Symmetry: none
Subunit: 136 residues, 7 copies
Amino acid sequence: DNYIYSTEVGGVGGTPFTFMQTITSIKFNWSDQYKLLHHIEVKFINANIYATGDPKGNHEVILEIDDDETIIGSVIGYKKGNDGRCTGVKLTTSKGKSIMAGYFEESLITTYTGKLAGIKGGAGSDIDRLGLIFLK
Amino acid sequence: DNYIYSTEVGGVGGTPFTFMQTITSIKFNWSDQYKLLHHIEVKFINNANIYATGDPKGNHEVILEIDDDETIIGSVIGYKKGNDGRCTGVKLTTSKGKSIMAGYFEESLITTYTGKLAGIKGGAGSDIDRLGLIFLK
Amino acid sequence: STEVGGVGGTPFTFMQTITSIKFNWSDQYKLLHHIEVKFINNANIYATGDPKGNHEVILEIDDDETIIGSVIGYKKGNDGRCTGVKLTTSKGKSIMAGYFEESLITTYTGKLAGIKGGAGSDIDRLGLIFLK
Amino acid sequence: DNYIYSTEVGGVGGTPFTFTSIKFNWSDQYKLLHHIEVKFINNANIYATGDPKGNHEVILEIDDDETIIGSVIGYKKGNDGRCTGVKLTTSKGKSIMAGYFEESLITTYTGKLAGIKGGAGSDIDRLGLIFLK
Amino acid sequence: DNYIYSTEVGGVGGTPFTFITSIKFNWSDQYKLLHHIEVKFINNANIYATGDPKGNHEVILEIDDDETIIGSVIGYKKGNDGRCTGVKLTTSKGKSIMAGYFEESLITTYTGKLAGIKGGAGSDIDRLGLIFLK
Amino acid sequence: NYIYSTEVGGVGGTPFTFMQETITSIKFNWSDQYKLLHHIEVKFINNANIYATGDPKGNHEVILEIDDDETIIGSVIGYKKGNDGRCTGVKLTTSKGKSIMAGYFEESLITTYTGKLAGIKGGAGSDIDRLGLIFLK
Amino acid sequence: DNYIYSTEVGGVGGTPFTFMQGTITSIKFNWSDQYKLLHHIEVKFINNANIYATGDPKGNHEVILEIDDDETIIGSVIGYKKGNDGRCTGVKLTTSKGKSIMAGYFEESLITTYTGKLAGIKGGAGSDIDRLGLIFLK
């Protein structure tokens, strides 16, 4: 209520997370071996790293977000089903910044857009499930 | 009406549906095995209900979330024509450069009316037999 | 617009602006075979020709949407036939029907108001009609 | 005049001519223009010239307020020359392409297409466009 | 004087020249050079030609009264024994021509209202420069 | 005043911090043999001094000169993650269409904050172990 | 000064040059496919008929960029080999009127220079262009 919840995509498994009250940094860890996201970290506008998942993947990417910078384009790749996983994230900002993490070989959601305020989902070894959260 | 009805394309078969109350989420399920749409889900502004139809047996899906102020500016449905017909693909593009592509387009096409996507309508069984979009004015 | 194609088939003229148009065509004959049209504030399907072709395309036109680009492919001569239509709208919508292996007209442009021509088995001849 | 006369390109042969719609006839067999027709604003007459023996034609209809912004004629140069192709593009993104461009080219003046001029027999020997000012 | 002279590019050979609403270039596939140029001027029906028009191709660019050159490249062989091999021009109205070849040297010239040409030719165009307003 | 981008790469090498209370020249040295940054130099407005760090043993370098009024609008650092990590590449693009590419991007990336490039900070030995940029506000 | 001095890139060798006066109105670059270096540069200036050359024009390629009086450089890259032993290997320039040249090669080091009205050059040349810097104005 005064936040927009994007559909969490991927499986029912892993341990729940919800990170909120905006985002100033987000990092994604992924593997070439499993072609999944494994681990996410978030910082806020608050010096603590809010992490989740196991950072066992051979790649990472970080997007730093200026205070006034919104997300204008966002795609999450995922395997659908109870047994599902998140496999990739593309984001593009109101300033022409973009990141690409992991793979997009199965299902996609083109999310809502706005000021990236938090994330929510389940993670174990892998990121089972991810949803973004925006302002209003 | 207060609504613009796109021609429903595909076959006469399956069970009829109409979803209305604007659309804030839509998902399309499709198969590489059958090369059809099989299942559609829709959510609406200020209403937590998932309105589904068809059998979600396909190996792929795509979800488009629509911002409150976001209109559809380009829309194409692929389909097999005739009574025995099926809807095979959807491309949509929004007023914010968001776009989805579901399934296949190697037979017939409709380039639909455009505006604020308000509902869908059609028939579905195992497959999406027939699909029409509905827009505001 | 100049009606292009042959002298044959049965004449048609559809008028009242156009809100929907459909084209049927074949890979076997590489012609248009059949056209349908709907009009604003009128639920009637005005058809013509034999819809025996394996493909069709439908373009829906918003009330305020004009045609900005239009090409008809055709075989010229008395025994001629209309073979293809490309249309592009003032809102980036476009359709492509059938084939363009012989002759072409780039038509006048504006609000698509009607069509006119002759059709039997095939669309023998087609011309568009525009506004003010 | 109060007109711009583009250089007529192609040969000296055929019979001279000087004239909202234009049509070009051409052949895959000879790779030339053979025949042109022109219709005028507020005048229902077809002004033709040349022999329409070619297997292709194209028609460009020009809206009243529509100018030509890009124009190329392909031709064989010399007394024995022939006009072989026309590309035209309008102020509304309409374009036609007639026949072939395997030898010489002129990029013509541009504006409101007012007439044509040239010589034609079996083939279009020679063609020039005429624009306003 | 009240003219801007682009560098004449190509060789020392051929006969010197000095001469816009029309320009034509003749060239050969056999020699890959310009061989001959013609020019017409506003309010003057004369063809000002130079060089031997023995090449199998030509192109003509007509320039509207108010139309300037906004991009211009001349291809040439450098050195005393040099030759001018090509011209690309683009106008303030999106017209463009391409004449001949560009497989050795290039100059990107000054831009403006194309006012004249200058340079030496015989069988081939040995050397060419454009001239603009000031 | 200043905005500190996350320093990416390893914990190793000797710490550095360059600022002058903005950057007008920056140079990056890298190797095809090690596929790392090895050395960085920075000059500042109204100060002739070269502030270097790292061992310039690499076979390539690039220099970006920044006009006084010119901001960075796009910036990516490639790096190997982990304690034994290294910085491997820098792409920068300016408010005047100027851009450099230094070294390699075969592992991890940060798309940094943007603004008037004011300083750098990190650790370097043989290699640039770790790099963060610093901007105004 | 009234002038902006780009870093001179390339080697210490060759004979020094400095070309300045109005601003640059023509510049030419000679280069070789055999050595993949610049070998020779010429410059002309506004209101001055003098051809200011330097280096040995032994290379199989050249390009000339003419600069209109009011035309600035908006993009500029010099390729070079770094070190005392070094040489300048290429120049890309792009103007405020969509003109561009590309001379020689960019297989080793690059500088993306300051931009503005190209007023002069400076460097060292022998057989090859050893070293080049551009000079601009505020």
